[PDB]
């Protein structure tokens, strides 16, 4: 059956404050001699928890202000740096003041995928402005993943399957009963899962058909491997009054060097990470294939680059070093920030994630990735 | 123990091609950087260009279109031909044993730093003035 | 600028702009009457047979201009002292600093 699961946890998008207090010790019953048919392709849970998030970001940009104002031409040079590195734009615009008959003359520093040119040479808009309509999320709400707990009413109950060589679906001995699912950090990103829960016995290899190239290969690591990141810039923000009570947090003078963001993954651990997953896609497509690995072929932005949130700023992270192996001292991996960001694959709803204050710093956990196999 | 002399006429009519010279011994031509450096009196010293056998050669930008650094292995001479001569070019001319440094603030795969030419053992000095 | 420092005290000779970047400022030294020496290079590394009296401001900060603090002033000390600012997020400076004449109260 399908019903609507409600969220237990333990200023912050996906309302956890609002949420039951979880048990402290959660009750599990394991299950004797019961098996039960899975399967993970069909779930309702992973469509209800989209439909969630998707909620959840739409109520926290709610009351948050809206930057209607900021499409405008703006004057556009590069930053200050001897230097590509066209990566930062300082824009100069008029913007509107308090006073609905008074207008300044103000600045910010805008990333260059966040602005298109128009037309002379040095006029500018923000991405959105042909597209959307931009909402500055609000500067206090985090997206930190707060873990979630998805638990069923009474007279429902969710179903555990135990077994650690699952292949996904299909029967799963060894069953157990559990009245909340484990904290679910809710992570986004792209070609990475990170922060999420590894398999216990062998590195798991799950398609829905292993035959479809359109179907995306989840793949499962029995161990994590670290990714470091940092935002090396300082990036002080700058608060310009746009309207009466209404405030837009710009970027403002950069306190060091101009250095390009990036995150950082163990070579010597990356490798045999990779060893692991080859082993287990040979047993699919027999012991004799060449398993390459190639970057992505092409696309958006947040498909190409391994797409994320790190402490409160969007990194699209090359991982171009990440992949490249035929198999018959760190990697490091440039990334880029935006901060127009149009998640859920929408129009419409484009927000601008305010500068954040001070450097930035990723210590997560690789436990998986989503591959796509060439036809 | 690296000795400069540095030669040049001391008078060159404007509007002429003012030539300069940097005797060296102790040291190769061919080895290290080698740099002039042009100080107007009573003004801070200019730093003219720099030029080496590798292919690296770089002079101001100002000076750039006017300015020609050579350097002579036969004779141990560093020959400065600064065209275009005008009245501003008075000054001492000193030649120097640029020596470079690393100055590493990033990630050096993303080209996160920079080439620093501090200027070693100096010579004594000429001074070219232009006059009719 | 004119500094002046009786011998036996601590001199402190600024040059240039406020730093923007990371920065390797070279330091110079011409005693009148002669040519240009160095002293200092990438902010606090001598040469063989410059004195340790002389030390100058780390480049690792920014929104400080470069500073030369020399110990224990003497004669020899007295002479103008320009500096070669190597900014990360400024182009090349082909020009020294404006120099400070160093004198000394002997």
């Known amino acids: 059956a399908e019903t609507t699961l409600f969220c237990a946890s333990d200023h912050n998008v996906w309302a956890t404050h609002a949420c039951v207090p979880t048990d402290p010790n959660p009750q599990e019953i394991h299950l004797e001699n019961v098996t039960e048919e899975f399967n993970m392709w069909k779930n309702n849970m992973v469509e209800q928890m989209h439909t969630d998030i998707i909620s959840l970001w739409d109520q926290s940009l709610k009351p948050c202000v809206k930057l209607t104002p900021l499409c405008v031409t703006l004057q556009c040079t590069n930053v200050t740096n001897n230097i590509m590195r066209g990566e930062l734009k300082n824009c100069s615009f008029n913007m509107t003041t308090e006073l609905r008959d008074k207008k300044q003359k103000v600045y910010s520093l805008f990333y260059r995928l966040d602005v298109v040119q128009i037309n002379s040479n040095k006029e500018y808009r923000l991405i959105n402005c042909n597209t959307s309509a931009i909402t500055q999320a609000c500067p206090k709400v985090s997206f930190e993943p707060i873990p979630i707990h998805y638990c069923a009413p009474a007279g429902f109950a969710i179903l555990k399957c135990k077994d650690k060589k699952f292949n996904g679906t299909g029967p799963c001995p060894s069953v157990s009963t559990v009245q909340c699912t484990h904290g679910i950090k809710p992570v986004v990103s792209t070609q990475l899962l990170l922060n999420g829960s590894l398999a216990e016995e062998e590195v798991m290899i799950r398609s829905e058909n292993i035959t479809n190239n359109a179907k995306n290969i989840l793949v499962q690591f029995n161990t994590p491997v670290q990714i470091n990141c940092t935002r090396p810039n300082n990036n002080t923000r700058k608060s310009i009054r746009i309207g009466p009570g209404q405030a837009f947090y710009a970027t403002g003078d950069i306190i060091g060097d101009i250095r390009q963001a990036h995150c950082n993954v163990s070579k010597a651990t990356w490798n045999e990470t990779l060893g692991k997953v080859v082993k287990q896609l040979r047993k699919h497509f027999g012991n004799n294939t060449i398993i390459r690995f190639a970057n992505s072929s092409g696309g958006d932005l947040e498909v190409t680059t391994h797409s994320f949130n790190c402490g409160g700023e969007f990194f699209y992270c090359n991982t171009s070093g990440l992949f490249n192996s035929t198999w018959i001292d760190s990697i490091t991996l440039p990334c880029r920030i935006k901060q127009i960001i149009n998640m859920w694959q929408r129009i419409g709803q484009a927000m601008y994630a305010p500068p954040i204050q001070g450097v930035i710093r990723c210590v997560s956990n690789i436990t998986g990735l989503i591959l796509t196999r060439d036809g | 123990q690296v000795h400069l002399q540095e030669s040049g006429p001391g008078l060159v009519k404007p509007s002429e091609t003012l030539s300069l010279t940097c005797n060296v011994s102790?040291?190769?031509?061919?080895?290290?950087?080698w740099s002039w450096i042009r100080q107007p009196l009573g003004k801070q010293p200019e730093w003219i260009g720099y030029?080496?056998?590798?292919?690296?050669?770089n002079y101001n930008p100002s000076l750039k279109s006017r300015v020609h650094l050579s350097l002579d292995k036969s004779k141990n001479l560093v020959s400065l031909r600064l065209t275009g001569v005008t009245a501003a070019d008075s000054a001492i001319y000193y030649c120097?044993?640029?020596?470079?440094?690393?100055?590493?603030?990033?990630?050096?795969?993303?080209?996160?730093?920079?080439?620093?030419?501090?200027?070693?053992?100096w010579g004594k000095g000429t001074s070219v003035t232009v006059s009719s | 600028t004119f500094v002046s420092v009786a011998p036996g005290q601590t001199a402190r000779i600024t040059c240039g702009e406020e730093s923007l970047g990371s920065r390797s400022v070279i330091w110079y030294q011409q005693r009148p009457g002669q040519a240009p020496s160095l002293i200092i290079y990438?902010?606090?590394?001598?040469?063989s047979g410059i004195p340790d009296r002389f030390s100058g401001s780390p480049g690792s900060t920014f929104g400080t201009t470069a500073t030369l603090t020399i110990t224990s002033v003497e004669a020899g000390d007295e002479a103008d002292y320009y500096c070669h600012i190597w900014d990360s997020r400024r182009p090349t400076n082909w020009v020294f600093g404006e120099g400070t004449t160093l004198i000394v109260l002997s």
């Open positions: 030029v080496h056998d590798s292919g690296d050669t």
């Open positions: 102790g040291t190769l031509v061919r080895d290290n950087y």
């Open positions: 990438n902010n606090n590394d001598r040469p």
């Open positions: 120097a044993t640029t020596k470079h440094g690393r100055r590493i603030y990033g990630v050096v795969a993303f080209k996160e730093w920079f080439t620093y030419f501090y200027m070693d053992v």
